[PDB]
Ligand binder design. Structure first.
Ligand SMILES: [Ca+2]
Ligand SMILES: [Ca+2]
Ligand SMILES: [Zn+2]
Ligand SMILES: [Zn+2]
Lengths: 388, 388
């Protein structure tokens, strides 16, 4: 084995789709059709909790919501940020899953997809806060969340799985808007939830209290998504959509840097093959059907030489280009090193590339030759082994 | 399709930025980074020409310059106007793009931003002349341009695109003068022209002979613009700056009326979203960067109750308040009617609001979701269908 060297709990964080345990009739994002990842970890002695933040919201907003769900309180988005983007300053209120974070407890965050951007941004906020929010607060005389002060530190490690640290070219597809929401619908269907029914109960809450957006009594997911597509959580720059783009991701990278206090681990995925006498990449047998028909072919061919989107960008997992996943590179100075058997603090420990697609790595799409329980249990044992 | 009912060629007219086909070396105002709109219309059978008048000059001066660019001759600003504002009576001399117009036939004018004011003014002069220039000429025994005589029905239609018919609140910003010249600097840089380089060749000629202003070869645009800011083309009432203001635009609307023999079409643009609880408008992802940072915020929040500049004025395309675009209203009796399939004479046929910004709509800023070719080919086809 490795020997347990820390007792930090694990916290799970989803991407641009995702929801809590009570949502979606209980079908879990972390485990999908394969079972319940949190429960398996807990059952094996690794305390684990799950976060639910806005799937379409910006990394900043998600990071504010996460802090509040972890420590307890009302989501405070920052008076400056909120004035700039025109949404409320305050979101929902949470009991707090781990109030010991205020007195020295720490955590391990395991994040999938965009969750990896959100996790990085939370560590950077904890540590350095935000100069702009500090200055706005005193100038306008309003209160200020401790999150924007800096000098807090409570994340021992961040692990990212299939994260677009450098963006994904998928956002450059012509009909990206309609295709992105058809993807949402496909994930709904993997969970046995219909997109043409006005469910009285909520089932998938987008957490859009700040923008005043809420599914209406009598409205289906089809109709809701048509409104979301025309609303600020899709058309502004304060969105997941902007942060997912190669250029948006680079801007985030310019200010969200690795902390020397925190171990970073990265997992990459791929599920494509290289075509004959082309550099193009094509979806492998078994890739989730939606991505195989709709996303994988564009991802495996779109090039932009002027921007450095070359041959190495075409390999993908059906949603994100594989090269984007080992850690932030564009607009960043973080260091990335191949895992060599000893994890190191303050740099990206590239744990390699797995032959599994974007939704398979979380159980949402089946893949019987992928032993997902062993993957997560082994990751938990490594996290458990990190020196404090 | 529809049937063609006139042979009237199309003439393109820019706004408060704009330059000739051979200027800005090749980078075209009409088409920018997307291509060359005049060329598409020509290659698709729609005969088309391009005018280039003083970008910062008053609508009157532009109109006079436009007249002479079309029928040929030496520009004539009118002796009364010239002595009143203190600039030369005569400007440049042109061969004429369509001297045949002097003896019959017609044109369709498609004009963007302030070109729309200019087009409306040309039509009014063509049809009514100027009583004032008539009296002056007679009282002083001096010659008179046929432009001021009246009785010339050269224009079959005027289509406006993002025109500030009731003005734009941008002019009310605290540092409008400095920011306006930064806007010019930004359009230069979109064509790759630097503002700190002492270009020997003209590159972008402001066509300010009447005022004796011209950039000295080897003078940078930075330096030139500094002189323009302190010159009459920035400081007098005979300028674009004044006609683009709310009161200036109301004054123009008080005398430039819709002619009964001409079809007017307006296209409106918007690229902002409404804030959750402020009524304010905010720039959408994708809006050209200069506007999004420097202009759209002020536009989407500036109100002046005294003048009825309301919540409805806040929606914008990054340069002009959208409500200003469907046609003249402040100080006008023109009738404006939503398009219902048939274009009517002597009124404003409001063709709708498009989700495109001020520069995207002429191709100067990119927007892959906007099919700019089809937008122009459809319009041309519609203009070709008009019954004279
Ligand atoms: Ca599969
Ligand atoms: Ca754009
Ligand atoms: Zn926000
Ligand atoms: Zn003048």
């Amino acid at each position: 084995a490795s020997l347990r060297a820390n007792d930090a709990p694990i916290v799970l964080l989803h991407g641009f789709t995702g929801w809590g345990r009570e949502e979606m009739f209980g079908f879990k994002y972390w485990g999908g059709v394969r079972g319940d990842i949190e429960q398996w970890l807990n059952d094996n002695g690794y305390r684990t909790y799950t976060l639910a933040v806005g799937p379409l919201s910006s990394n900043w907003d998600r990071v504010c919501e996460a802090y509040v769900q972890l420590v307890g309180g009302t989501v405070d988005y920052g008076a400056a940020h909120a004035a700039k983007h025109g949404h409320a300053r305050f979101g929902r209120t949470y009991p707090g899953l781990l109030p010991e974070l205020k007195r020295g407890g720490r955590i391990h965050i395991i994040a999938h997809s965009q969750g990896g951007q959100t996790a990085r941004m939370l560590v950077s906020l904890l540590e350095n806060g935000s100069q702009e929010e500090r200055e706005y607060a005193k100038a306008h005389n309003v209160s200020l969340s401790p999150l924007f002060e800096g000098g807090h530190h409570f994340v021992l490690s961040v692990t990212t799985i299939a994260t677009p640290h450098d963006g994904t070219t998928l956002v450059n597809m012509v009909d990206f808007t309609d295709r992105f929401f058809d993807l949402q619908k496909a994930v709904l269907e993997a969970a046995a939830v219909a997109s043409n029914v006005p469910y009285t109960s909520q089932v998938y809450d987008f957490k859009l209290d700040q923008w005043g957006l809420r599914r209406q009594p009598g409205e289906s997911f089809d109709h809701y998504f048509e409104r979301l597509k025309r609303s600020p959580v899709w058309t502004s720059t304060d969105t997941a959509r902007y942060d997912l783009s190669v250029s948006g991701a680079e801007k985030l990278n310019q200010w969200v840097q690795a902390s020397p206090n925190t171990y970073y681990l990265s997992f990459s995925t791929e599920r494509t093959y290289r075509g004959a006498l082309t550099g193009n990449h094509y979806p492998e047998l078994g890739m989730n059907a939606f991505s195989a028909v709709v996303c994988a072919p564009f991802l495996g061919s779109y090039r932009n030489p002027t921007l450095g989107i070359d041959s190495h960008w075409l390999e993908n997992d059906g949603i994100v280009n594989t090269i984007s996943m080992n850690g932030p590179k564009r607009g960043s100075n973080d260091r990335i090193v191949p895992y060599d058997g000893t994890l190191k603090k303050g740099v990206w420990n590239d744990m390699g590339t797995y032959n599994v697609d974007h939704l398979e790595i979380i159980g949402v799409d089946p893949n019987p030759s992928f032993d997902i329980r062993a993957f997560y249990l082994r990751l938990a044992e490594q996290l458990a082994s990190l020196q404090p």
